[PDB]
Design a protein around this ligand. Structure first.
Ligand SMILES: [K+]
Ligand SMILES: [K+]
Ligand SMILES: [Zn+2]
Lengths: 364, 5
């Protein structure tokens, strides 16, 4: 009944090396440790994913290319553009070891849930949901979320994937778009020009998996109250229709106010309410991180959410620790929404929710 | 192909 916390000092150091989010893993763990939450959890050392484990989703051609460019850090390789390596996903030295580490950590978490040693397994450094079978994408080199679901598949016949990242979890949706045994649900910003450009409400999966992909297109400026209304409405209908045996939850903090992407206007409290709703299902749950580019706020959010999982109220004052100086200007745990408009029209939201309700009527 | 980022 004690939550599993995927952590090792080696694992955090590796995750710190990602160019797009340097030192974020350290800051998240350091704050969690400063609140002493790790003492209330079962700390589990992550394994490194084998080539074969990664090949359960990713193609050998792609994996071999990753390993190749990882050796010398071969930027400007002729085939790199084809495999998605570029501005978003640079071909840096040791990137293969980075991929295998994160993929292994999520698999380890999934294996803990399978063994029944816990009901909640946490990997805050995972959740890289953009990666395709043969293509890096959106800062993601390996889709650890897919690898984790594939592992959970060995025991749980129906798996629900819930993606609360700011961006559409297109990698995970595409991976399972043709099956009805994994349902993916994504709430995300949807607007022409905004990455990755997919995930309209009309995208519902294909073939046998038709209506087993749920997409909730949302506009800039949404805050806690409306977001939870939308989330609770969709998840209630999804839970009744799909009846999941396990849940994979992606909680990218790039929705949080203060993020440089400045799109959604959320606080960890709002996200926490969505988390609580899923947690009271009492199903095996894999918790992943994802986006989050205000590093202090991302740490604030996932530390708060960890407290939520443990059912603990945390002190409002950030305790002194290695990165205390980064928590200005008020050095508190809570985050204040920005004073900017919510661009979501209630009639648009209502139309979206009705479209989804109609789609889920087919799910039987 | 969009840019993230
Ligand atoms: K999302
Ligand atoms: K599906
Ligand atoms: Zn994101």
């Amino acid at each position: 009944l004690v939550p599993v916390y995927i952590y090792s000092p080696e694992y955090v150091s590796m995750c710190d090396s990602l160019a797009k989010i340097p030192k974020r893993a350290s800051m998240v763990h350091s704050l969690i440790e400063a609140y002493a939450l790790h003492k209330q959890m079962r700390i589990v050392k992550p394994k490194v994913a084998s080539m074969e484990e990664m090949a359960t989703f990713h193609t050998d051609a792609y994996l071999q290319h990753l390993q190749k460019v990882s050796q010398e850090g071969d930027d400007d390789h002729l085939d790199s553009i084809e495999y998605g390596l570029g501005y978003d996903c640079p071909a840096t030295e040791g990137i293969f070891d980075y991929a295998a580490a994160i993929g292994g950590a999520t698999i380890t978490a999934a294996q803990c849930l399978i063994d029944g040693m816990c009901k909640v397994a946490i990997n805050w450094s995972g959740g890289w949901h953009h990666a395709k079978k043969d293509e890096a994408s959106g800062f993601c080199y390996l889709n650890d979320a897919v690898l984790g679901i594939l592992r959970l598949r060995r025991k749980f016949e129906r798996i629900l994937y819930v993606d609360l990242d700011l961006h559409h979890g297109d990698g995970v949706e595409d991976a399972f778009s043709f099956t009805s045994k994994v349902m993916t649900v994504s709430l995300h910003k949807f607007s022409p020009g905004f990455f990755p450009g997919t995930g309209d409400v009309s995208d519902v999966g294909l073939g046998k998996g038709r209506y087993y992909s749920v997409n909730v297109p949302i506009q800039d400026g949404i805050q806690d109250e409306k977001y939870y209304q939308i989330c609770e409405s969709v998840l209630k209908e999804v839970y009744q229709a799909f009846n999941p045996k396990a849940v994979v939850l992606q909680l990218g903090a790039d929705t949080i106010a203060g993020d440089p992407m400045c799109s959604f206007n959320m606080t960890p409290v709002g996200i926490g309410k969505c988390l609580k709703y899923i947690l009271q299902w009492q199903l095996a749950t894999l918790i992943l991180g994802g986006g989050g580019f205000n590093l202090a706020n991302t740490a604030r959010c996932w530390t708060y959410l960890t407290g939520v999982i443990l059912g603990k109220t945390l002190s409002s004052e950030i305790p002194d620790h290695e990165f205390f100086t980064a928590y200005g200007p008020d050095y508190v745990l809570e985050i204040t929404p920005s004073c900017r408009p919510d661009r979501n029209e209630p009639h648009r939201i209502q139309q979206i929710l009705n479209y989804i309700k109609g789609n889920l009527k087919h799910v039987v | 192909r969009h840019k993230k980022x």
